[PDB]
Each structure stands twice: as structure tokens, then as C-alpha cells.
């Protein structure tokens, strides 16, 4: 399936994923598209920060869901 990642700058990124992908894996895919290190990515869905070690399946994220990317330089 695909999921979407809305950025602050405006662009929405489309990623090819599977339910077993970790949030880390999603951030790795964003880095391949956008050049943003996973370090600096905070992903949000339904108002909650997504943790790196959990899967898309753990968060019941299905195809065509939209995550929000927040850049966090550190604070």
C-alpha cells in the first residue's frame, strides 16, 4: 500500500509500505526521498508522536492514511 506524509513546507510525500514496516523504516524512506535524517523527523498521526520501534500494524495505520511530519532540529 501507500501512505502519505504531509510536510510543513506543503508537499505531501507518498511512500510504499507494508504493515511490518517500523516507524524507523518509514523515516528511512522519507530520508531517501527528501534527505531529512530520521534523527530530525517527528511523525504524528491522530494527535500522537509515533515511536520508532513500533510498526505500522501496531498503530493500525492503513493504506492512504496521512502522517504529519514535524522537523525537530532538537527542541
Curated annotation (Swiss-Prot):
Record domain Ubiquitin-like: where: 1-75
Compartments reported by the entry: Cytoplasm; Nucleus; Mitochondrion outer membrane
Domain of life, per lineage: Eukaryota
Topology within the bilayer: Peripheral membrane protein
PTM entry text: Phosphorylated ubiquitin specifically binds and activates parkin (PRKN), triggering mitophagy. Phosphorylation does not affect E1-mediated E2 charging of ubiquitin but affects discharging of E2 enzymes to form polyubiquitin chains. It also affects deubiquitination by deubiquitinase enzymes such as USP30.
Its biological purpose: Exists either covalently attached to another protein, or free (unanchored). When covalently bound, it is conjugated to target proteins via an isopeptide bond either as a monomer (monoubiquitin), a polymer linked via different Lys residues of the ubiquitin (polyubiquitin chains) or a linear polymer linked via the initiator Met of the ubiquitin (linear polyubiquitin chains).
Protein name from the UniProt record: Ubiquitin
Amino acid at each position: 500500500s501507500q501512505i502519505f506524509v504531509k510536510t510543513l513546507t506543503g508537499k505531501t510525500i507518498t511512500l510504499e509500505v507494508e504493515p511490518s514496516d517500523t516507524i524507523e523504516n518509514v523515516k528511512a524512506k522519507i530520508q531517501d526521498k527528501e534527505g531529512i535524517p530520521p534523527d530530525q523527523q517527528r511523525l504524528i498521526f491522530a494527535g500522537k508522536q509515533l515511536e520508532d520501534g513500533r510498526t505500522l500494524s501496531d498503530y493500525n495505520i492503513q493504506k492512504e492514511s496521512t502522517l504529519h511530519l514535524v522537523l525537530r532540529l532538537r527542541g
